Design a protein around this ligand. Structure first.
Ligand code: FAD
Ligand code: FAD
Lengths: 645, 645
């Protein structure tokens, strides 16, 4: 028997903060159901480099996100825009959730995304305190090793940002309007100050820096360890070995291996929750006040639909007997990021000194920069505010070795063994495609529901006059346009690096080796010779430009369209399944019911400006104050932090 | 309350026969738990062409094996031999199991596989009656439309089989030793008799025919319908709408949507089985005599391991509390088939007449032949009996259109729109690789367990002398050798077709367009100039043949090794997870327990000579007589068949 008045389902990035700070500041009885044990002893979780497979057995060399004993394994339906490939993108299965298996990065997101895309009450000035709270809770660190490649790249970026600042055009990709004429590029010399990307006031929307902030901490011995939600908020100092709380937190219960099925639900009010344990028995817990769903973006709409909230026609079709509320918007608007990869060759006799000091330590995890960039000059899909507000579009990442898939490694002829290649990535942060989630069987939580997500689709013309069917091709082709413009933005960095490396003491040469170089120079020339309407040549049957130059450009675009489909990576930043306004109101309460709330990343109405870990924790932190009634977390002094064991 | 003395889990190809003929011939109380409703009204299941997506909604065009509401969706761990790609291969989820979503083909398997690879009591003369039983139960039909391409191919096969019969070599791929000197190729002219591939006496181990036997039946209206296990054995004539039996079968209960978890198991004797229904409640059923597991190859070891039979150390590690029997061989020896694809171009002005009468009707489903072939002359991995017994190695299939993946369609430049291309496939029936299955969470039946299956791995040499490390490279390279020899066997058919099409009234030319033609002629020349030790050049660091010709051959082999990895298809013929001798004895009884048996395809000790649907039904049929005690099914007259509603 386990009656309690707050029941949280899932201890992820948001569940842990919620439980911890909700039992600290009140006397209600909190229950946390997670379905996964605590990996506080596993060397593959505590050690940061275990992310790269240092402790893997020889015969089962698979990463944690491919291990069914560490992660939920959802595979999406064939991708009609990527040659119908199905992708498996995972969720963490442990205390701490996906933060137990992630890359440990802290992009906070810009100021402008919250100011312009989130509803009132969620503007940036209303949430910055919670971001400060989560950052102070973790205390990330910076890179502990310098490298001259970062120097060369930073000089190149400032060199071309100088000419972008002039020329008067307003929406180039290195223009930050909160700083003014001077470029927002970190200085590169002895004793240079560090431009902080997650700054408090949100000044830096577009900036170039030399290091990220990764969530690890150094021990007195010398070893580094992971610092995740389950490490800080539910550790042996705050919770017993039996799951009971201790002292201040004695009003807290955590059940370890408890897979939750649905919400037994009297009238339109929640009254009980059932789950299954490792024994195989079914248990019921009684609810007095509130149910919180923090089960992740893929599996929150699933449990909501199984309970009875969703589309009545479909749910009746598959066989859900108990219907509650007819909201056909549950599980809509799924969003994600997407990172295409380019890689560059260095030609010379003694390039080793140029690529030295790049191996992955636990303080950077192979990230060496390099910045956040805004919209390209020639992208037609921009918000109207772009003239007066700087948005975040691309996240630039530089890494050693090759990062393409193994099949592409064979096909392109470039191998990971050689030592004159390095990778650049322009991750898309405002990715356009939208998908959705539905369940297929109303029995128990299934590992694979129906997930639909099509990215790089094409446009099939009609007999409509060309003048009035361009502005549907624009929307249908947005992602391909953005990926190609990212290719161009990376390409026009490398000759700047040529100049900088020449005048910094290096006899080296840099060229883009993947995709093929000529295929990129042709894109550069096509862009600068066709202007703002360059993208019309994606559909060659409407341009009516039958000249051989136009045919060349169209063929180049068609050939380039292959690379982002196959030689890229879909990220694991799922969100917005049950966003604000769609499924829940500003108070995180589900429409059509009076005592259930959803507070994980699946409630965000727009993805943040980068990696989506701070946002989920912030949502949980604000849910704490929403539930209790008055702001206690928002006013805690920053010197009060959870101690670590 | 549902006590009964026989409880079957899963109504697949073997569960339906077992339940039907076990309640017909006895008075025990039979219960069948399936976890899936009856699709007797769904047009996408009853109509054969619904397999190809005739009734699919426009926005969700996915086949039945990719639909989570029709199939279990297991994805295997990254394939170290295929550029680390994860493949999703499904199981049927309905009455009838995988036969509700399959291709409807009836390869029975040869005589020699059962005579040489299965234990005593399971030789061919001990089982042929049950194969006749299942075939008479279904009554498949042959192709209802002729085509001249089959004529040309059959002439070509007999032409080269004539010269293979001479030349005295004993193990070519068109030699059948049960017929003698004359070729075993169907005659090709007016009123020719039909050589039956599933013949009663098992004479035809290697034969060339013009049609397969697909499991459909024609109605009086004119429409064809699917004829599967759930259609024949559990239909409205034998089982009520409520799941009760009727009259003769009144001693039978079928529960529709019941997902089974584990076996509650007193002492070392089975006493109860628990399941979950669509309501979300957990039910228990009492067992008096027997439990049958017919849950498929992927999910039978899963339920056995969750119950408590398996490896104690690992099961304790993941958290199974109740341990029963320590058999570390549960879930070992997983086998499957594998089909690489080649495709051929026809060059000429009026090839349309040559490729006419090839569209897929419900009586062939785009299969137009062409035979079963034995070992190639130059394969080193052959059983010792191969001199005196003919084994089945390849299954040859001919089809219209292109059958490669969409990515390969783009890369190779060949498109499905054009009308001068057709596909050939040499499916490997004695596929060498072996994998295994383990569970990752002891809570509930998960859709994705750990499945390990690596196919086309490479050999890394050591400092061991070359003379005494060849016979480990042979075993490690068996699958690649077999695939390449299949490529060669297909290639040396097309010039025979050149001659036959010339002398049959056609001005057409045939050449292998995928893989590239020169890459195949070089393989042909390398084979005939390097002899039986041609495969030594897979590892170029040991041959010590530094001549440029040897370098050419090694490069050709390395380039050809890419095609079977990416341009092929893994089949859905899983088997042998709990085979005879490994997990169960000759009586299908699980070792370490006295009242549980497993009777689905996961009990086969060696895959059959072709498509694995007749074998599963045969196993169920023999289990019927094993359970009752005396042969009632083995002596039923062939004119007694289940009527159809
Ligand atoms: C491969 C990978 C890489 C990542 N890289 C980064 C990165 O570079 N930067 C970054 O900032 N973030 C990264 N992340 C993390 C990710 O971006 C966010 O942290 C994530 O969205 C956190 O959201 P969440 O806490 O709401 O969900 P989760 O953390 O996934 O919470 C899910 C929790 O709910 C539980 N649960 C689910 N279903 C049930 C059920 N039926 N019953 C009971 N419990 C249930 C699960 O066990 C788990 O504890 C990565 C994640 C992965 C997997
Ligand atoms: C895509 C595809 C193509 C195929 N093509 C061919 C072909 O060309 N030729 C051919 O001969 N065969 C074909 N097959 C069929 C296949 O080769 C065999 O018929 C199959 O191995 C049948 O084995 P089975 O009956 O033991 O397993 P299944 O038929 O898969 O039986 C599984 C049954 O167990 C049930 N079950 C599983 N787990 C549970 C659980 N926990 N609780 C309750 N019930 C459970 C499932 O609901 C299902 O009813 C194809 C199958 C597929 C999927």
């Amino acid at each position: 028997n386990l009656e309690a008045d707050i029941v949280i389902i899932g201890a992820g990035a948001a569940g842990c903060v919620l439980a911890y700070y909700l039992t600290k500041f009140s006397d209600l009885k909190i229950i946390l159901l997670e379905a996964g044990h605590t990996h506080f002893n596993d060397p593959v979780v505590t050690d940061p480099m275990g992310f790269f497979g240092k402790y893997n057995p020889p015969n089962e060399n698979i990463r944690m996100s491919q291990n069914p004993s560490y992660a939920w394994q959802p595979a999406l339906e064939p991708d009609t825009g990527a040659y119908s490939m199905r992708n498996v993108v995972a969720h963490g299965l442990a205390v701490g959730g996906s933060t137990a298996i992630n890359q440990l990065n802290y992009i906070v997101g810009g100021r402008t995304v919250f100011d312009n895309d989130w509803p009132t009450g969620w503007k940036y000035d209303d949430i910055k305190k919670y971001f400060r709270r989560v950052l102070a809770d973790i205390s990330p660190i910076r890179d502990g090793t310098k490298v001259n490649l970062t120097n060369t790249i930073l000089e190149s970026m400032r060199v071309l940002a100088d000419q972008q600042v002039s020329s008067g055009v307003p929406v180039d990709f290195l223009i930050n309007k909160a700083t003014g004429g001077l470029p927002n590029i970190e200085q590169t010399y002895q004793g240079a100050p560090i431009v902080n990307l997650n700054d408090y006031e949100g000044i830096n929307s577009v900036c170039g820096f030399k290091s990220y902030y990764v969530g690890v901490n150094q021990l007195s011995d010398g070893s580094y360890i992971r610092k995740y939600a389950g490490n800080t908020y539910l550790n042996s100092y705050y919770v017993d070995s039996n799951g009971f709380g201790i002292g201040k937190f004695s009003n807290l219960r955590v059940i370890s291996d408890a897979v939750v099925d649905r919400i037994h639900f009297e009238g339109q009010r929640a009254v009980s929750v059932t789950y299954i344990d490792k024994k195989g028995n079914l248990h019921s817990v009684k609810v007095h006040k509130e149910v919180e769903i923090c089960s992740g973006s893929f599996f929150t709409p699933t449990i909501l639909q199984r309970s009875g909230i969703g589309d009545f026609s479909y749910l009746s079709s598959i066989g859900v007997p108990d219907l509650v509320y007819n909201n056909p918007l549950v599980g809509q608007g799924l969003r994600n990021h997407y990172s295409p990869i380019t890689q560059v060759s260095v030609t010379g006799p003694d390039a080793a000194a140029f690529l030295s000091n790049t191996a992955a330590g636990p303080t950077n995890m192979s990230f060496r920069g390099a910045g956040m960039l805004g919209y390209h000059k020639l992208e037609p899909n921009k918000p109207s505010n772009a003239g007066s507000v700087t948005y975040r579009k691309y996240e630039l990442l530089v890494t050693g070795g090759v990062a393409i898939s193994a099949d592409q490694q064979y096909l392109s002829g470039i191998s990971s063994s050689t030592g004159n290649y390095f990778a650049l990535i322009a991750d898309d942060i405002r990715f356009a495609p939208v998908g959705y989630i539905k369940i297929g069987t109303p029995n128990f939580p299934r590992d694979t529901p129906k997930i639909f997500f099509n990215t790089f689709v094409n446009y099939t013309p009609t007999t409509d006059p060309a003048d009035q069917q361009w502005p549907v091709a624009q929307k249908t082709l947005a992602p391909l346009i953005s990926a190609l413009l990212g290719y161009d933005a990376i390409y026009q960095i490398v000759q700047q690096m040529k100049v900088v490396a020449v005048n910094a003491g290096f006899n080296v040469t840099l060229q883009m080796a993947y995709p093929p170089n000529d295929l990129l120079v042709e894109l550069h020339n096509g862009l600068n010779t066709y202007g703002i309407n360059w993208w019309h040549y994606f559909v060659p049957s409407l341009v009516n430009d039958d000249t051989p130059a136009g045919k060349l450009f169209a063929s180049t675009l068609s050939k380039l369209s292959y690379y982002p489909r196959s030689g890229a990576h879909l990220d694991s930043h799922q969100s917005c399944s049950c966003s604000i306004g769609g499924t829940v109101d500003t108070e995180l309460k589900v429409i059509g019911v009076e005592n259930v709330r959803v507070t994980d990343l699946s409630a965000a109405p727009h993805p943040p400006g980068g990696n989506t870990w701070c946002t989920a924790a912030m949502i949980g932190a604000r849910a704490t104050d929403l539930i209790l009634g008055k702001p206690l977390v928002a006013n805690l002094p920053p010197e009060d932090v959870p101690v670590f064991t």
